[PDB]
């Protein structure tokens, strides 16, 4: 009773794996053929692009590439821009008539 | 059933996208310099937006001038335009297409 | 029973994956420079995302300029683009394939 | 009863994906043709700029 | 070659992400520039501070 039961249910597990495996293979195959049609059509269209179209693809990619490059600047805090001479020039004028 | 059906949706969508590019490719052949100019003019402020935007997060900026030098805002604003100008000359290194309406090549 | 059955699932799946690559390999023969360009343009911002993303975790950044120098944002932004540009030239050392649409080779 | 039910409803899901896929393809195609007319007309006008 | 380029282009983002991961631990970043000296010029009087 234990043996016949275990054997019958093990065959069910194997039947499930086989049926699912075959269904999956049919989907992967069909999906590959559809995706190849995209690659082919995209290629047959792109092959006809002129310089103004090639420039459009790059001009569309620049903002994308720029945004990801500039993101770390969001963490900038202080920025100090000294200028005009290469020295530590602290000239400040005004008396302390009353400060201790 | 769902897999076989989805492959048809991908294929149907693929054919439509391909005819879009085909007609867009034919239209680009008419883009003389007077039309190409607008492509640069539209995307120049957009590239400046994604470069300047994250830089505006800065909490404080201080400018100090001395003797011979300028005040400083010119340096600050200059860096934004410089990063924007450095980018097109940078991508040209990994793909020979030009982002400079003739003038040089 | 489960082992013998699984080997059939691997084999069935193997045959389908192989026909996918076979038809994808035939399609790649049609990729002229005008099509190859898009492969670079799509994956350039993606490489910048995985390089810039972890760098954005930085808690504070401080920029100081003096005399002759630039402000500093150009150095910071420059390093992201530099690491992105250094990578393709780095993998080329352990495999001679090119990630630069002609221009050089 | 479980099998016939699951199969009938799986076919409904597949019918929905196919119908929506076809409708979408018709829209993408029509929208491309309209957008190409913009590009063409904009180009034919810009080409005359002084 | 277009297919061989596709395999590499797909591997770059993968390799890039694992290389850049340690930057998540960066805290402070200080970028001095323009001159090779300790130039602390600061201007403004303390009319009232002790």
Curated annotation (Swiss-Prot), chains B, C:
The modification Phosphoserine is found at residue 68. It is found in: Cell membrane; Endosome; Membrane, Caveola; Melanosome. The modification Phosphothreonine is found at residue 70. It comes from the Eukaryota. Heterooligomeric complex of flotillin-1 and flotillin-2 and caveolin-1 and caveolin-2. Interacts with ECPAS. May act as a scaffolding protein within caveolar membranes, functionally participating in formation of caveolae or caveolae-like vesicles. Belongs to the band 7/mec-2 family. Flotillin subfamily. This is Flotillin-1. The lineage of its organism: Eukaryota, Metazoa, Chordata, Craniata, Vertebrata. The gene is FLOT1. The chain holds residues 318 to 422 of 427 of the full protein.
